[PDB]
Amino acid sequence: MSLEEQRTRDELKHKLLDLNQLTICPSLLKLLHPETGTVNSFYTHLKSSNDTENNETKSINGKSAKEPHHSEHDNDNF
Amino acid sequence: ESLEFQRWLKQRDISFKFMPNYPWEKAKDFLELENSLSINRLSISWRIMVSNFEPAIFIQHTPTLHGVWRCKDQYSSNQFSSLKNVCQYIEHHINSLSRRSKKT
Amino acid sequence: MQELYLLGVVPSRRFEAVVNSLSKTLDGPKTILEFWVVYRPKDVPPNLPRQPDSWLRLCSNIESHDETDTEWSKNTQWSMYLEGNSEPKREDKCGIRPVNRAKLTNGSVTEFVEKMGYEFSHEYIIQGLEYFFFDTTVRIYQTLIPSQQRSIKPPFHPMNEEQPWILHVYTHVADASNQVAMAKAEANLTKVKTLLSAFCDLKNVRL
Amino acid sequence: KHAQLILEQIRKELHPNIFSEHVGGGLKIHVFDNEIIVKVNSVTGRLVLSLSPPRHLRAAEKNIALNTQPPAQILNRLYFFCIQTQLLEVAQCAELHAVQGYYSFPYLTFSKGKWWVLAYNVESNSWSVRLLNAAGQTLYTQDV
Amino acid sequence: PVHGVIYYSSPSMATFLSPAQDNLVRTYFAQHLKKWVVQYKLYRNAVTPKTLEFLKQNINPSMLACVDEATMIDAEPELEDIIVRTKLWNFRQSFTIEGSIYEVGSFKVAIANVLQKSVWKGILFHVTYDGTESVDLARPIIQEFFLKCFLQNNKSVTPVYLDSKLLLQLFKQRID
Amino acid sequence: AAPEMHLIKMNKTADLTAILKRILAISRKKXXXXXXXXXXXXXXXXXXXXXX
């Protein structure tokens, strides 16, 4: 249902796969499933470590490092 | 100057944070205040806030006396002359950041 | 770097009393602590430069360093000097010796003079006091011989522990070509000589 | 008397565009308007920015310490340069890079981010969209 | 932060093609090999040699490589030259590296015309870029911009890793 | 080409046109508000202005 929003996080996980194009991360996708239980190219320029985040209505923190993926407590997921 | 910032945002009650880290906070002896009043660069970050889930446009600010307003967002860092430049820049936010957030 | 300078012995018995006539009226006191190695470039053929200056002088300032700490020998600041000799016909006049004030930055330090192959020779330690007058300064001497080669541990070895205080006013010219700093600093330090003359008798010595 | 004679000296060595007044040497590197004064006694002139000034005064006045090369067109350097920094701050959003390689004129290049080439020029400021290569077909406005 | 200086058989164009690029510019990128030869023999090679090159990394350290080839000590003097001049030491045909490093963006391109004592040698190119990636996640993709602007007649020499490493890497082209 | 008195062809946003805008054939008319039934009419008044 709301998992499509998490799918965007999965798309963010796909962005990590896109970062792979540039394992435990799959477990992070499982964490996105746990979330299911409950432009940006300029941000890449900021990564060109950096910072980014998801919104509406979940503050996943897609900060670049690898990268952060913390949910929003701080929920310091990567 | 920082008062001008704070008064500038008292105008509109947006959340923001003055963040001092003074040398004169420190003085292990009376001779360290002697070094505590150096003209050296002094960070004073600000944290303007109305956006929720997204992290603040965190700011670098080191108003060295001589020899000093460079923010950073998720896009690009930018030095500003007047604090008024910061103000109007966040006005470019009060329009365009709002619109770009609407398109997200 | 054309150093301009004089020399005058101070017996230790009157030393600190002189310091009262000095440091209260001057910058400092600053204790000196610097380990020398005056390596001699034994070389062929004659005529060698052979002069004492021609022999190399690595100059490890260590005054802030511990008397027993082990990292010193190639981590604490070093230097190097050949230096020109003081001028001929410099009678009574402050000696003028041009100076190459070398500096260095690597874990390797001494090694390059032996990369130049130069042999070890005599060694000591500046250990006197120095009192500023802008670019000019006085440098009263203490040059104890170190207790062992490459050993920073005291007691060291003055030729007598009734050690002479080889008082030594000086300055360091950037370049000798102009008359400016010549007569200027010679005048200022001659007045410094008038100051010491209230308690000492400096003289030029050939170098 | 000599002082106001210098005030008119540079003022008539200066451009009409920038009205130097006796109110206090109001140099007019627009938007900013700032003081021009020569120091009483020992020189290093007391020209002043309107709050805290940076190197500009320091540069013109240490240039006075240099004495050589009288300042007038140099004031024009101050004008175009401080304005350069101003526009650089205006160059931030809409990254009009104004890279100067394609011509080295005092007229000064304006450019664009990201970028066969279609040029971009303004001066008075006057919005003369002079896209060029060479010289492409253009369009012009005088707004603002 | 991989290094990758490249020698080229098609010079001149760096002064010409890079400005022709529509993008942004920074500052100087010049450095100088200085071969040495002791006025007598004895000190001929290795640890105690005729060989020496103070290396003018002018861009940042302003510190010479006080190096008798693979003899690691560094210093600004200069005064050391005169110290070395105690009835001693000469030179040999070293080739200086000078140029033209410019701001770009995610990466930036150091540029330098190269100069033998016989006037010319041949231009070198370099591009600094973020170092968190493994050596070739994008380095060839960076070299897409070695083909943009297109670059021609490159020498095979490949020094590899901030930029202090380039000092030893100078030898990689110096020993040639 | 052009061909026809039809104009816009339009883009954002507010401006004091002089370059200008809302061109019919080639030359601009700066009639951003012009109706599809009145854009060609704007090009007709522009034709009235075309005498010099």
Side-chain angles (χ1 to χ4, degrees), chain B residues 20-42:
Chain B
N21 57 345
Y22 304 141
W24 54 84
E25 301 301 325
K26 180 182 170 62
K28 302 296 177 63
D29 61 352
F30 300 154
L31 274 65
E32 289 182 354
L33 176 58
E34 179 181 1
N35 293 337
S36 298
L37 298 175
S38 62
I39 67 101
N40 61 346
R41 59 186 67 85
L42 177 63

PDB file of all heavy atoms in Angstrom, chain B residues 20-42:
ATOM      1  N   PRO B  20      27.471  30.207  18.700  1.00  0.00           N
ATOM      2  CA  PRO B  20      28.769  30.715  19.154  1.00  0.00           C
ATOM      3  C   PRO B  20      29.745  29.600  19.518  1.00  0.00           C
ATOM      4  O   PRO B  20      29.328  28.545  19.991  1.00  0.00           O
ATOM      5  CB  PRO B  20      28.405  31.536  20.388  1.00  0.00           C
ATOM      6  CG  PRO B  20      27.222  30.850  20.937  1.00  0.00           C
ATOM      7  CD  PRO B  20      26.451  30.316  19.758  1.00  0.00           C
ATOM      8  N   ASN B  21      31.029  29.838  19.290  1.00  0.00           N
ATOM      9  CA  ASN B  21      32.075  28.925  19.734  1.00  0.00           C
ATOM     10  C   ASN B  21      33.329  29.716  20.084  1.00  0.00           C
ATOM     11  O   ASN B  21      34.413  29.476  19.549  1.00  0.00           O
ATOM     12  CB  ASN B  21      32.354  27.870  18.663  1.00  0.00           C
ATOM     13  CG  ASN B  21      32.733  28.477  17.330  1.00  0.00           C
ATOM     14  OD1 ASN B  21      32.532  29.668  17.100  1.00  0.00           O
ATOM     15  ND2 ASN B  21      33.279  27.658  16.441  1.00  0.00           N
ATOM     16  N   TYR B  22      33.160  30.655  21.006  1.00  0.00           N
ATOM     17  CA  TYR B  22      34.144  31.696  21.269  1.00  0.00           C
ATOM     18  C   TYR B  22      35.428  31.203  21.916  1.00  0.00           C
ATOM     19  O   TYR B  22      35.408  30.315  22.766  1.00  0.00           O
ATOM     20  CB  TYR B  22      33.534  32.768  22.159  1.00  0.00           C
ATOM     21  CG  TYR B  22      32.277  33.371  21.597  1.00  0.00           C
ATOM     22  CD1 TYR B  22      31.216  33.686  22.424  1.00  0.00           C
ATOM     23  CD2 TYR B  22      32.149  33.624  20.239  1.00  0.00           C
ATOM     24  CE1 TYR B  22      30.069  34.232  21.928  1.00  0.00           C
ATOM     25  CE2 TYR B  22      30.994  34.175  19.728  1.00  0.00           C
ATOM     26  CZ  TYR B  22      29.956  34.479  20.583  1.00  0.00           C
ATOM     27  OH  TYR B  22      28.794  35.029  20.105  1.00  0.00           O
ATOM     28  N   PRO B  23      36.558  31.776  21.495  1.00  0.00           N
ATOM     29  CA  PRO B  23      37.859  31.621  22.149  1.00  0.00           C
ATOM     30  C   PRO B  23      37.838  32.086  23.602  1.00  0.00           C
ATOM     31  O   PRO B  23      38.530  31.513  24.439  1.00  0.00           O
ATOM     32  CB  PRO B  23      38.783  32.497  21.306  1.00  0.00           C
ATOM     33  CG  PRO B  23      38.133  32.538  19.967  1.00  0.00           C
ATOM     34  CD  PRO B  23      36.666  32.574  20.259  1.00  0.00           C
ATOM     35  N   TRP B  24      37.045  33.114  23.893  1.00  0.00           N
ATOM     36  CA  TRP B  24      37.012  33.667  25.241  1.00  0.00           C
ATOM     37  C   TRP B  24      36.131  32.836  26.163  1.00  0.00           C
ATOM     38  O   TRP B  24      36.057  33.100  27.364  1.00  0.00           O
ATOM     39  CB  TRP B  24      36.552  35.129  25.238  1.00  0.00           C
ATOM     40  CG  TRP B  24      35.244  35.400  24.560  1.00  0.00           C
ATOM     41  CD1 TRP B  24      33.998  35.279  25.101  1.00  0.00           C
ATOM     42  CD2 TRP B  24      35.057  35.925  23.241  1.00  0.00           C
ATOM     43  NE1 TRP B  24      33.044  35.652  24.185  1.00  0.00           N
ATOM     44  CE2 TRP B  24      33.670  36.058  23.035  1.00  0.00           C
ATOM     45  CE3 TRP B  24      35.929  36.278  22.207  1.00  0.00           C
ATOM     46  CZ2 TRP B  24      33.134  36.528  21.839  1.00  0.00           C
ATOM     47  CZ3 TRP B  24      35.394  36.744  21.019  1.00  0.00           C
ATOM     48  CH2 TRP B  24      34.011  36.863  20.845  1.00  0.00           C
ATOM     49  N   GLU B  25      35.459  31.838  25.602  1.00  0.00           N
ATOM     50  CA  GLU B  25      34.830  30.817  26.425  1.00  0.00           C
ATOM     51  C   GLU B  25      35.940  30.104  27.182  1.00  0.00           C
ATOM     52  O   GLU B  25      35.765  29.662  28.316  1.00  0.00           O
ATOM     53  CB  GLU B  25      34.047  29.811  25.583  1.00  0.00           C
ATOM     54  CG  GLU B  25      32.928  30.383  24.728  1.00  0.00           C
ATOM     55  CD  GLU B  25      31.868  31.111  25.525  1.00  0.00           C
ATOM     56  OE1 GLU B  25      31.570  30.683  26.658  1.00  0.00           O
ATOM     57  OE2 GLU B  25      31.311  32.095  24.999  1.00  0.00           O
ATOM     58  N   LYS B  26      37.091  30.003  26.523  1.00  0.00           N
ATOM     59  CA  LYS B  26      38.254  29.317  27.066  1.00  0.00           C
ATOM     60  C   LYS B  26      39.262  30.276  27.689  1.00  0.00           C
ATOM     61  O   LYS B  26      39.523  31.350  27.147  1.00  0.00           O
ATOM     62  CB  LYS B  26      38.939  28.502  25.968  1.00  0.00           C
ATOM     63  CG  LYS B  26      40.174  27.750  26.426  1.00  0.00           C
ATOM     64  CD  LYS B  26      40.824  27.018  25.268  1.00  0.00           C
ATOM     65  CE  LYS B  26      42.179  26.459  25.662  1.00  0.00           C
ATOM     66  NZ  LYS B  26      42.064  25.456  26.749  1.00  0.00           N
ATOM     67  N   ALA B  27      39.838  29.857  28.815  1.00  0.00           N
ATOM     68  CA  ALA B  27      40.901  30.594  29.490  1.00  0.00           C
ATOM     69  C   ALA B  27      41.464  29.773  30.644  1.00  0.00           C
ATOM     70  O   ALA B  27      41.069  29.959  31.793  1.00  0.00           O
ATOM     71  CB  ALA B  27      40.397  31.934  29.998  1.00  0.00           C
ATOM     72  N   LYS B  28      42.384  28.863  30.337  1.00  0.00           N
ATOM     73  CA  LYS B  28      42.995  28.028  31.365  1.00  0.00           C
ATOM     74  C   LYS B  28      43.863  28.874  32.288  1.00  0.00           C
ATOM     75  O   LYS B  28      44.145  28.491  33.421  1.00  0.00           O
ATOM     76  CB  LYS B  28      43.810  26.904  30.732  1.00  0.00           C
ATOM     77  CG  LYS B  28      42.978  26.026  29.819  1.00  0.00           C
ATOM     78  CD  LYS B  28      41.903  25.286  30.595  1.00  0.00           C
ATOM     79  CE  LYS B  28      41.025  24.460  29.669  1.00  0.00           C
ATOM     80  NZ  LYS B  28      41.792  23.394  28.973  1.00  0.00           N
ATOM     81  N   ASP B  29      44.290  30.026  31.784  1.00  0.00           N
ATOM     82  CA  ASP B  29      44.919  31.047  32.610  1.00  0.00           C
ATOM     83  C   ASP B  29      44.598  32.410  32.017  1.00  0.00           C
ATOM     84  O   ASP B  29      44.043  32.504  30.922  1.00  0.00           O
ATOM     85  CB  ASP B  29      46.433  30.837  32.727  1.00  0.00           C
ATOM     86  CG  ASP B  29      47.148  30.912  31.394  1.00  0.00           C
ATOM     87  OD1 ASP B  29      46.472  30.978  30.351  1.00  0.00           O
ATOM     88  OD2 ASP B  29      48.396  30.913  31.392  1.00  0.00           O
ATOM     89  N   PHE B  30      44.957  33.463  32.738  1.00  0.00           N
ATOM     90  CA  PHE B  30      44.588  34.818  32.357  1.00  0.00           C
ATOM     91  C   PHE B  30      45.276  35.213  31.054  1.00  0.00           C
ATOM     92  O   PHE B  30      44.870  36.163  30.388  1.00  0.00           O
ATOM     93  CB  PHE B  30      44.940  35.790  33.482  1.00  0.00           C
ATOM     94  CG  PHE B  30      44.231  35.492  34.775  1.00  0.00           C
ATOM     95  CD1 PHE B  30      44.773  35.884  35.986  1.00  0.00           C
ATOM     96  CD2 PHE B  30      43.040  34.782  34.780  1.00  0.00           C
ATOM     97  CE1 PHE B  30      44.129  35.594  37.175  1.00  0.00           C
ATOM     98  CE2 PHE B  30      42.393  34.492  35.965  1.00  0.00           C
ATOM     99  CZ  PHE B  30      42.938  34.897  37.162  1.00  0.00           C
ATOM    100  N   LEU B  31      46.328  34.480  30.708  1.00  0.00           N
ATOM    101  CA  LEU B  31      47.072  34.730  29.480  1.00  0.00           C
ATOM    102  C   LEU B  31      46.446  34.094  28.236  1.00  0.00           C
ATOM    103  O   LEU B  31      46.916  34.331  27.126  1.00  0.00           O
ATOM    104  CB  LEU B  31      48.515  34.239  29.633  1.00  0.00           C
ATOM    105  CG  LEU B  31      49.530  35.195  30.268  1.00  0.00           C
ATOM    106  CD1 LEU B  31      49.196  35.483  31.721  1.00  0.00           C
ATOM    107  CD2 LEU B  31      50.938  34.632  30.144  1.00  0.00           C
ATOM    108  N   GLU B  32      45.419  33.265  28.402  1.00  0.00           N
ATOM    109  CA  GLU B  32      44.746  32.701  27.231  1.00  0.00           C
ATOM    110  C   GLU B  32      43.684  33.630  26.650  1.00  0.00           C
ATOM    111  O   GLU B  32      43.321  33.496  25.485  1.00  0.00           O
ATOM    112  CB  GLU B  32      44.119  31.342  27.550  1.00  0.00           C
ATOM    113  CG  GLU B  32      45.131  30.225  27.746  1.00  0.00           C
ATOM    114  CD  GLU B  32      44.484  28.882  28.017  1.00  0.00           C
ATOM    115  OE1 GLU B  32      43.247  28.835  28.168  1.00  0.00           O
ATOM    116  OE2 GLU B  32      45.216  27.873  28.085  1.00  0.00           O
ATOM    117  N   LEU B  33      43.186  34.569  27.451  1.00  0.00           N
ATOM    118  CA  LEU B  33      42.302  35.597  26.911  1.00  0.00           C
ATOM    119  C   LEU B  33      43.113  36.475  25.973  1.00  0.00           C
ATOM    120  O   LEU B  33      42.587  37.055  25.021  1.00  0.00           O
ATOM    121  CB  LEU B  33      41.656  36.428  28.019  1.00  0.00           C
ATOM    122  CG  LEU B  33      40.797  37.592  27.517  1.00  0.00           C
ATOM    123  CD1 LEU B  33      39.690  37.087  26.609  1.00  0.00           C
ATOM    124  CD2 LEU B  33      40.217  38.376  28.681  1.00  0.00           C
ATOM    125  N   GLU B  34      44.411  36.531  26.243  1.00  0.00           N
ATOM    126  CA  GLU B  34      45.355  37.262  25.416  1.00  0.00           C
ATOM    127  C   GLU B  34      45.360  36.715  23.997  1.00  0.00           C
ATOM    128  O   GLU B  34      45.578  37.448  23.035  1.00  0.00           O
ATOM    129  CB  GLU B  34      46.752  37.169  26.027  1.00  0.00           C
ATOM    130  CG  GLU B  34      47.850  37.863  25.258  1.00  0.00           C
ATOM    131  CD  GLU B  34      49.195  37.703  25.932  1.00  0.00           C
ATOM    132  OE1 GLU B  34      49.256  37.028  26.982  1.00  0.00           O
ATOM    133  OE2 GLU B  34      50.193  38.242  25.410  1.00  0.00           O
ATOM    134  N   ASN B  35      45.108  35.418  23.874  1.00  0.00           N
ATOM    135  CA  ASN B  35      45.018  34.789  22.569  1.00  0.00           C
ATOM    136  C   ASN B  35      43.568  34.611  22.140  1.00  0.00           C
ATOM    137  O   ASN B  35      43.288  34.221  21.007  1.00  0.00           O
ATOM    138  CB  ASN B  35      45.740  33.446  22.585  1.00  0.00           C
ATOM    139  CG  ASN B  35      47.234  33.598  22.772  1.00  0.00           C
ATOM    140  OD1 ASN B  35      47.801  34.649  22.479  1.00  0.00           O
ATOM    141  ND2 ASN B  35      47.882  32.549  23.265  1.00  0.00           N
ATOM    142  N   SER B  36      42.649  34.907  23.053  1.00  0.00           N
ATOM    143  CA  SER B  36      41.228  34.675  22.821  1.00  0.00           C
ATOM    144  C   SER B  36      40.566  35.796  22.032  1.00  0.00           C
ATOM    145  O   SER B  36      39.402  35.692  21.649  1.00  0.00           O
ATOM    146  CB  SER B  36      40.496  34.485  24.148  1.00  0.00           C
ATOM    147  OG  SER B  36      40.979  33.345  24.837  1.00  0.00           O
ATOM    148  N   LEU B  37      41.303  36.875  21.800  1.00  0.00           N
ATOM    149  CA  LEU B  37      40.744  38.030  21.114  1.00  0.00           C
ATOM    150  C   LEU B  37      41.437  38.256  19.774  1.00  0.00           C
ATOM    151  O   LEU B  37      41.509  39.379  19.275  1.00  0.00           O
ATOM    152  CB  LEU B  37      40.845  39.264  22.005  1.00  0.00           C
ATOM    153  CG  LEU B  37      40.033  39.086  23.291  1.00  0.00           C
ATOM    154  CD1 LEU B  37      40.217  40.258  24.236  1.00  0.00           C
ATOM    155  CD2 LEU B  37      38.560  38.868  22.972  1.00  0.00           C
ATOM    156  N   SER B  38      41.947  37.171  19.203  1.00  0.00           N
ATOM    157  CA  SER B  38      42.556  37.193  17.880  1.00  0.00           C
ATOM    158  C   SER B  38      41.497  37.393  16.798  1.00  0.00           C
ATOM    159  O   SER B  38      40.331  37.058  16.994  1.00  0.00           O
ATOM    160  CB  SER B  38      43.338  35.902  17.631  1.00  0.00           C
ATOM    161  OG  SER B  38      42.485  34.773  17.657  1.00  0.00           O
ATOM    162  N   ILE B  39      41.909  37.935  15.655  1.00  0.00           N
ATOM    163  CA  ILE B  39      40.976  38.311  14.593  1.00  0.00           C
ATOM    164  C   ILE B  39      40.543  37.094  13.793  1.00  0.00           C
ATOM    165  O   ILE B  39      39.754  37.205  12.851  1.00  0.00           O
ATOM    166  CB  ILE B  39      41.592  39.345  13.625  1.00  0.00           C
ATOM    167  CG1 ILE B  39      42.745  38.728  12.826  1.00  0.00           C
ATOM    168  CG2 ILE B  39      42.072  40.566  14.389  1.00  0.00           C
ATOM    169  CD1 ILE B  39      42.366  38.326  11.406  1.00  0.00           C
ATOM    170  N   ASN B  40      41.075  35.940  14.177  1.00  0.00           N
ATOM    171  CA  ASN B  40      40.917  34.708  13.422  1.00  0.00           C
ATOM    172  C   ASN B  40      39.466  34.361  13.126  1.00  0.00           C
ATOM    173  O   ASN B  40      38.548  34.813  13.813  1.00  0.00           O
ATOM    174  CB  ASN B  40      41.581  33.551  14.170  1.00  0.00           C
ATOM    175  CG  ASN B  40      40.974  33.314  15.538  1.00  0.00           C
ATOM    176  OD1 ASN B  40      40.242  34.155  16.062  1.00  0.00           O
ATOM    177  ND2 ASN B  40      41.287  32.170  16.133  1.00  0.00           N
ATOM    178  N   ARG B  41      39.279  33.569  12.077  1.00  0.00           N
ATOM    179  CA  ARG B  41      37.960  33.217  11.579  1.00  0.00           C
ATOM    180  C   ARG B  41      37.108  32.561  12.656  1.00  0.00           C
ATOM    181  O   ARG B  41      37.580  31.715  13.413  1.00  0.00           O
ATOM    182  CB  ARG B  41      38.102  32.297  10.364  1.00  0.00           C
ATOM    183  CG  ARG B  41      38.853  31.004  10.656  1.00  0.00           C
ATOM    184  CD  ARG B  41      39.090  30.190   9.395  1.00  0.00           C
ATOM    185  NE  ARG B  41      40.003  30.864   8.476  1.00  0.00           N
ATOM    186  CZ  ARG B  41      41.330  30.786   8.550  1.00  0.00           C
ATOM    187  NH1 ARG B  41      41.902  30.065   9.502  1.00  0.00           N
ATOM    188  NH2 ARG B  41      42.086  31.431   7.670  1.00  0.00           N
ATOM    189  N   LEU B  42      35.846  32.966  12.719  1.00  0.00           N
ATOM    190  CA  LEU B  42      34.962  32.516  13.780  1.00  0.00           C
ATOM    191  C   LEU B  42      33.675  31.952  13.212  1.00  0.00           C
ATOM    192  O   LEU B  42      32.850  32.692  12.693  1.00  0.00           O
ATOM    193  CB  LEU B  42      34.652  33.668  14.735  1.00  0.00           C
ATOM    194  CG  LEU B  42      33.675  33.351  15.867  1.00  0.00           C
ATOM    195  CD1 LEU B  42      34.251  32.283  16.777  1.00  0.00           C
ATOM    196  CD2 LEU B  42      33.330  34.603  16.661  1.00  0.00           C
TER     197      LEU B  42
END
